[PDB]
Structures are given as C-alpha cells and as structure tokens.
Amino acid sequence: TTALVCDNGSGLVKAGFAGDDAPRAVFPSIVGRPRHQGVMVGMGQKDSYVGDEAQSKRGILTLKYPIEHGIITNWDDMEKIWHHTFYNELRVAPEEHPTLLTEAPLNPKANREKMTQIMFETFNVPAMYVAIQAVLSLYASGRTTGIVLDSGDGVTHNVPIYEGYALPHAIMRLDLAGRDLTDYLMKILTERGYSFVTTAEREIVRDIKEKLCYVALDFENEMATAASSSSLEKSYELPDGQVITIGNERFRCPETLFQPSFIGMESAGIHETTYNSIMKCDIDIRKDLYANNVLSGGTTMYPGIADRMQKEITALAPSTMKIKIIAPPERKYSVWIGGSILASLSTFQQMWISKQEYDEAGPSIVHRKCF
Amino acid sequence: MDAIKKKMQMLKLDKENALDRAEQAEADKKAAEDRSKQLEDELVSLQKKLKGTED
Amino acid sequence: MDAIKKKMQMLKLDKENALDRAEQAEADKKAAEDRSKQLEDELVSLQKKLKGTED
Amino acid sequence: DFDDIHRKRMEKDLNELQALIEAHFENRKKEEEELVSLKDRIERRRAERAEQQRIRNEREKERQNR
Ligand SMILES: Nc1ncnc2c1ncn2[C@@H]1O[C@H](COP(=O)(O)OP(=O)(O)O)[C@@H](O)[C@H]1O
Ligand SMILES: [Mg+2]
Numbered sequence: 204t205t206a207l208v209c210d211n212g213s214g215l216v217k218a219g220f221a222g223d224d225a226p227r228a229v230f231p232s233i234v235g236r237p238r239h240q241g242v243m244v245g246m247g248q249k250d251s252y253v254g255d256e257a258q259s260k261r262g263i264l265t266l267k268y269p270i271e272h273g274i275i276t277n278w279d280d281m282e283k284i285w286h287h288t289f290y291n292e293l294r295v296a297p298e299e300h301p302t303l304l305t306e307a308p309l310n311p312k313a314n315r316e317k318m319t320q321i322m323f324e325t326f327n328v329p330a331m332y333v334a335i336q337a338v339l340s341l342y343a344s345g346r347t348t349g350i351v352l353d354s355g356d357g358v359t360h361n362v363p364i365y366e367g368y369a370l371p372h373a374i375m376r377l378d379l380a381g382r383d384l385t386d387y388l389m390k391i392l393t394e395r396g397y398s399f400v401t402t403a404e405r406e407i408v409r410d411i412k413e414k415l416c417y418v419a420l421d422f423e424n425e426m427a428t429a430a431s432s433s434s435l436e437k438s439y440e441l442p443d444g445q446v447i448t449i450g451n452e453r454f455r456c457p458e459t460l461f462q463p464s465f466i467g468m469e470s471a472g473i474h475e476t477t478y479n480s481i482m483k484c485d486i487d488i489r490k491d492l493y494a495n496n497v498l499s500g501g502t503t504m505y506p507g508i509a510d511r512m513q514k515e516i517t518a519l520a521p522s523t524m525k526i527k528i529i530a531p532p533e534r535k536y537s538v539w540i541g542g543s544i545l546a547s548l549s550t551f552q553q554m555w556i557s558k559q560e561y562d563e564a565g566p567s568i569v570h571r572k573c574f
Numbered sequence: 575m576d577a578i579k580k581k582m583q584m585l586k587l588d589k590e591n592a593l594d595r596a597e598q599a600e601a602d603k604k605a606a607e608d609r610s611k612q613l614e615d616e617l618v619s620l621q622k623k624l625k626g627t628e629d
Numbered sequence: 630m631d632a633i634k635k636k637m638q639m640l641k642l643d644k645e646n647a648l649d650r651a652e653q654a655e656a657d658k659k660a661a662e663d664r665s666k667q668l669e670d671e672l673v674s675l676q677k678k679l680k681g682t683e684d
Numbered sequence: 685d686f687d688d689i690h691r692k693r694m695e696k697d698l699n700e701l702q703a704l705i706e707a708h709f710e711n712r713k714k715e716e717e718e719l720v721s722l723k724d725r726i727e728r729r730r731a732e733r734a735e736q737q738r739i740r741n742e743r744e745k746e747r748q749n750r
Contacts, residue, residue: 345689527594532583577704578633584697585640592647599654606658610665617672624679 206301208542209288210336211281213270213357214381215501216254217539218288221303221546226539228292230255234280235264253287261403272378273307273358274314282321289326297326301555303546305336305538308360309376312570320566323558330555333569337362338369339541340499344529348488349495352477353538354460354502356381359473361480365488373483375476379463381502385409387466388416388456397447411439411449412456417506419454420514422461426451457505461515474515493524499537503530 206221212232219227235257241248257264269280289297302322306315315333322331337351341364344351350363360376362369389399389408399408415437419425429435429451438448459465461472470476481492496516498509509530517526531537545551556573564571 345686347685525597575708577701577708580704581701582636582640584701585637585644587697588644589640589647592644592651596647596651596654599651599658603654603658603661606661606665610661610668613665613668613672617668617675620672620675620679624675624682627679627682 204299204301206303206546207289207293207295207297208303208539208546209285210305210539210542211270211275212305212538213268213273213355215356216284216288217536218293219539219543220293221543223543224540225536228288229536230292231258232270232284233257233266233268234283235261235266237263238265239263251283253283254292258406261406264403266402266406270357272380273310275318278317278321282325285321285326297322297328300328301546302328302331303542304331304333305339305542306333307355307358307376308335308337308362308374315569316566319556319561319569323561323566328558330557332555332573334542334545335362336360336538337499338364339539339545340537341497342541342544343499343533343537344497344531344541346495346497346529348491349497349529350477350481350492351497351499352473352503353499354380354473355500356502359500359502361473361477363480363484363492365484365491370484373480375480377463377470377473377476379460379466379468379470379473383466384456384459384502385412387459388412388452391452391455392449394452395447395450407442411447415439415449416453416456418457418460418508418511420507420511422454422458425454429454457508460502460508461511472515474512475519477512478516478519490524493520494527495529496527497529499534501535504534 207218208221208226209218210216210226214232215229216232217226217229219225231254234251234253236251237248252260252264257266267277267280269275269277269284275281289295304318304322306318319331319333322328336355337353337360340351340353341347341349347367348365350361352361353359357380358376358378359380360374363373364370385405385408388411389405392399392408392411399405435453436448436450437453438446440446455465461474463470463472471479477496481489484492493516496512498512509528513526513528516528520526533540554573556568560573561568
C-alpha cells in the first residue's frame with residue numbers, strides 16, 4: 204500500500220500520500236473553543252473547530268496553537284488535530300497506512316516517545332517512522348551534501364550534512380522563527396496607532412506580514428530612505444475596511460532574523476549561526492558546504508532574503524570561497540516533498556518501526572536502531 | 575499576474591546558471607594560465623642551468 | 630505594457646553576456662592548456678639533453 | 685542523484701510556461717470581449733427600460749392630475 208507522509212510542523216500541517224509533488228491538504232494547526240454564550244438553539248454548534256474551519260469562524264473563537272516551539276505542549280489538542288487530518292482532510296483510515304512524521308532536531312525525548320505511543324495506540328497505524336526535518340529538505344533539493352537552514356514557523360535549525368554523513372556536533376538550533384516575527388510586527392504596528400490584541404487578530408497581523416514585509420538588502424540605507432521619501436508606504440485593507448499604511452515597519456519586522464537583539468534575544472542572526480555551524484565542521488568539507496548552502500522552510504520566503512544572506516556570508520567567509528545560496532521556488536513544501544521522496548524509496552522500506560517491534564520494546568524503541 | 579511571474583523566474587534561473595558558468599570558466603582560465611606561466615619559468619631556469627653546465 | 634519588455638530584454642542580455650564571456654574564457658583555457666602541454670614536452674627533452682651534457 | 689533535476693525542472697521550464705500562456709489567452713478571449721459586449725447589451729436594455737418608465741410615468745401623471 205501507500206504511505207502517509209504527514210508533517211506536523213508548527214503553524215501549517217502538511218499531509219499527503221507518498222509519491223506526489225505537493226501535499227494534498229494544507230491547513231493551519233489551530234484548535235479554537237468558542238468563548239461567548241450562544242443563544243440560538245439547534246444551530247448545531249460544536250465544542251471545538253479545528254483546522255481550516257476555525258480560520259473562518261475566528262471572530263468568536265479563541266484559537267490556540269498546540270505546538271509552541273517544535274515541542275508539543277497540549278497533547279489532547281494535537282491528538283484532535285491528527286484525527287482531523289486523517290479522517291476529514293484525507294479520508295483514509297490509519298489502520299492500513301504507514302506514517303512518516305517529522306521532528307525538529309534537539310527536541311525533548313518525551314515528545315517523540317509520546318508521539319509514537321499515540322500513533323501506535325490510538326490511531327493504530329501499521330508502522331511509523333520519525334525523521335529529522337532538515338534531511339528531508341536536503342532530499343528535495345536532489346543534493347547529497349550541503350548545510351540546510353530550515354527556518355520554519357516554530358524553530359529555526361541549521362543541520363550541516365556531507366556526503367550523507369550528518370555532523371551531530373554542528374547542529375545549531377535557534378528558537379527565533381515566524382511566530383516571533385508575527386509578535387514583533389504586532390508590537391511595532393502600535394507605533395502608528397493600530398492595536399491588535401485578540402488571538403484572532405494575530406492572524407490578521409500574520410497576513411500583513413506575509414503580503415507586505417520584505418528583507419532589506421542594506422538596513423541603514425533603507426532606514427534612511429524610508430525616513431525621507433514615501434515610496435515605500437504600502438497600504439492594506441483590513442477584514443472590515445479602514446485601510447492601514449505600513450511605512451518602515453515593512454523591512455523592520457523580518458530584520459529581526461539577522462539581529463535577534465530586536466526582540467531581546469542574545470544570540471546572533473541567521474546570517475552568523477550558519478557561518479558558525481560551518482566553522483565547527485572539519486577543515487576539508489568547508490568549501491562544499493559554502494557552495495551548497497540550502498534554504499528551506501516557510502519563513503525563508505521573504506522577498507530579497509537570498510541576496511541579503513549571501514551578502515552577509517560573503518562578508519564573513521574568506522574571500523576565495525564561492526558562496527552560493529540554493530533557494531528553490533517550492534521552498535514552503537520542501538520538507539514534505541523530501542518526505543515523499545524518502546517514503547517512496549525501496550531501500551528505505553525496511554526501516555519502518557513495525558508494530559510487533561513496538562510491542563516488544565515499548566515506546567522507547569524510537570531512540571534505538573530504528574531512529 | 576500568474577504566468578508572467580513564472581516566466582520571469584525561468585529567465586532568472588537562466589541568468590544565475592549562465593553567470594555562474596561564466597565566473598567558473600574565468601576562474602579556470604586564471605588557474606590554467608598561471609600553471610602555464612609557472613611551467614615556462616621553470617623551463618627558463620632549466621635553460622640557464624644548462625648554460626652554466628655548458629660553461 | 631512597459632515593465633515586462635525592458636526587464637525581459639535586460640535579463641536575456643545578461644544571460645547572453647554571461648554565455649559569451651564563458652565561451653571566451655573556455656577557449657583561452659583550452660589554448661593555454663595546449664601550450665602548457667607543449668612546454669612540458671619541450672622541458673622533458675631539455676632535461677634529457679642537460680643530463681647528457683652533465684654526463 | 686542530481687540526474688532527476690533535469691527531468692523535473694526542464695519539463696515545467698517550457699510546458700508550464702506554454703500552458704499558462706495558453707490559459708491566459710483563452711481566459712482573456714472568453715472573458716473581456718464577452719463582458720464588454722454583454723454590458724453594452726444590458727445598457728441598451730436599461731435605456732429601453734428608462735424610456736418605458738418615462739412614458740408610463742408621464743401618462744399616469746397626465747391622467748391622475750386632478
Ligand atoms: N509567502 C510568505 N512570505 C512570508 N512569510 C511566510 C510566507 N508563507 C509563510 N510564511 C511564514 O511561515 C510560516 C509557515 O511556515 P511553515 O514552513 O509552514 O512552518 P512549519 O515548518 O511548521 O510547516 C507562517 O507562519 C508565516 O509566518
Ligand atoms: Mg518545517
């Protein structure tokens with residue numbers, strides 16, 4: 204039979220059968236209970252709208268993501284999300300399909316063990332396998348080397364790989380991602396008068412960020428230009444009218460990636476953690492990693508980031524090496540495409556964690572040889 | 575619109591590939607010519623050593 | 630319209646410029662490589678005649 | 685590896701562009717001219733309705749004026 208390539212993510216759940224080009228169903232991972240009282244009788248009001256249904260009734264819900272930073276903080280809601288994904292968005296019972304979840308690097312063990320225990324006890328799948336979210340993004344590019352920066356919505360991690368041999372001592376995981384950029388944008392919009400507070404209006408700020416923000420090639424020059432002319436002010440129409448005008452908030456929101464001091468984080472930007480991740484590698488594979496830097500994940504879709512990052516790394520790196528940044532147009536679904544490719548391989552067909560194996564060793568089987 | 579963006583992206587992929595190939599070829603020319611000129615210098619020194627041996 | 634024409638023409642010009650530059654570089658690389666081969670071949674015989682002279 | 689990049693890239697490099705150009709051409713042809721012609725037709729019908737309304741209003745005002 205065919206395998207189910209699910210990809211929990213944090214912000215958008217992407218799923219679909221193995222062997223295709225794009226995920227079949229992509230929908231936000233939010234579960235929102237209603238918060239008001241409700242007076243109409245017999246309206247058929249449910250107790251929790253999940254997935255894309257709660258992005259249409261969000262006016263009277265309190266949306267809450269079940270995955271904070273890669274890790275899962277609310278297991279009941281995550282179980283509800285998985286149940287919805289299997290039964291309503293794909294309509295395939297899990298009793299007859301292997302599953303291939305994905306997990307960020309350096310995550311707590313208990314999260315992974317609970318994930319496999321749920322998949323084997325509640326949904327009762329035949330066999331499931333957990334894979335690191337960066338190796339798949341490297342599969343999708345058709346490479347076999349390269350250092351991949353997978354800046355998702357929950358957590359940004361940077362896994363270097365050479366000739367198929369991952370370097371476990373050079374993984375640099377940073378917890379700045381799309382959600383923190385949304386919060387920072389929502390916080391700097393208040394400097395013009397627009398106040399978004401409700402958890403429903405966070406979605407509106409996210410839409411503003413997606414449609415308007417861009418990464419500046421040079422930050423100081425843009426700050427000077429936006430403060431003199433008015434060629435940058437782009438307007439946007441809220442879900443009820445009252446258009447708003449975003450000035451130099453456009454390139455200040457995604458600039459947080461390269462200067463995490465804006466949101467008070469100490470660490471260095473995504474332009475310098477990649478160079479540090481490279482320098483921890485051996486001295487003989489640094490040229491190949493320099494030449495095959497891969498971008499993935501949703502947050503790396505800002506217009507103009509593949510040039511800013513290349514300029515920064517070229518500034519840091521030695522002058523002789525060639526710096527090349529692979530930015531495929533299908534960046535958002537790169538991890539899932541790689542997952543489909545991996546699940547479609549014949550050599551991989553014996554790596555699944557078969558159910559009888561789980562019955563013999565318990566949930567701690569995932570840390571064992573079947574990784 | 576829709577198709578126009580994709581066509582622009584194709585025109586940009588051609589741009590990147592052609593530019594990268596040009597740069598790589600230029601680096602190859604620099605390296606090869608340096609090799610040749612160093613070999614020529616070695617040949618010159620051998621001629622001078624032969625001259626000393628002849629003396 | 631106006632923007633599509635100018636951008637497309639400029640990008641095609643960039644591709645053509647890179648291609649022709651790469652071709653020129655590769656031609657010079659091949660010529661330098663062959664001349665280097667000639668230098669090697671002559672240098673070996675120079676060494677042989679030097680060795681005979683020294684004997 | 686790196687040999688499926690051709691077979692997954694070069695395909696859509698031309699087929700996708702040509703197909704989207706075809707879609708745009710057919711959609712524009714189907715949409716714009718038919719919409720403008722239909723709007724002109726509805727405008728003519730609207731003018732005829734306006735004439736009928738004026739005639740009826742005037743005759744009723746003529747009779748009813750007492
Ligand atoms: N076109 C876009 N431009 C800018 N940011 C985007 C765009 N699309 C998605 N994002 C950001 O990326 C996030 C989605 O990232 P995603 O790759 O789905 O995360 P995950 O790894 O959990 O799947 C969204 O929250 C949004 O903030
Ligand atoms: Mg991801």
